[PDB]
Write a protein that binds this ligand. Sequence first.
Ligand code: FE
Ligand code: FE
Lengths: 144, 144
Amino acid sequence: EPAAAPNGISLPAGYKDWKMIGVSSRIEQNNLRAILGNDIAVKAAREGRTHPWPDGAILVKLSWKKSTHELFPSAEVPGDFTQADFMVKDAAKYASTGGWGYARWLGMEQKPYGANADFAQECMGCHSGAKAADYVFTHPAKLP
Amino acid sequence: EPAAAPNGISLPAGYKDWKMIGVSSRIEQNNLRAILGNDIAVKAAREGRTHPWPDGAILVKLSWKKSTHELFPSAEVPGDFTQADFMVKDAAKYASTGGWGYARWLGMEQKPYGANADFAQECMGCHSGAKAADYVFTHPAKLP
Ligand SMILES: [Fe+3]
Ligand SMILES: [Fe+3]
């Protein structure tokens, strides 16, 4: 089992089996990302209950290096897995980080990120830009 | 319910709840895609049972136009939904098209694509390029 994050959050088991909320590509990072969520999160996302997200909602963003497909150079496809970023909603328990518990695990080896238990202030530094949207940038992708 | 594709393939129910296989960005279309699969596909993907894919495997590629996040411009994020493309493995039934049943539904309106029952030959036009990988371009994204 991977080590916990320095703020005590354990790696959510089973996140590879979760349903999709969106996808993204970060230009500046040369990364492709999938955004998944547990069933609490997915229900919320689909029903628009995101002001705030419900307690128990977990979002995960999975990041891979962009490569190009060997048979189809215009297709940018995942290569190396770089990290898994989580946000766990618990309004009471993480009230100091805006009601979310942040945690990141690096690579296939899944080393928990962060020098100490205050690493999540780094997350907050950017995520506070989405404070109006409960610190979540992702808009759930449209599906019929 | 959406109409069946011209070759008789019905839209698979609950595809939006399928597990992820991968993601991609197609430079020449300015889209983002999510590649999901039914549980047969996902089990095959994860175990490397892709030479060939087993009968019953269904892959779906969901496509959105690329948009830029209003709060973070270097993040390309899904805009409008443009199409759902499906490949249904049945080596006997779809022997004429490489053992795969192809089908595409367009837009939020889920209009079946194709002029007639032979529309899949278009798909085979490019997919034949991936014949060494059982006509599947996608390489499952690697996760821990
Ligand atoms: Fe973030
Ligand atoms: Fe295709």
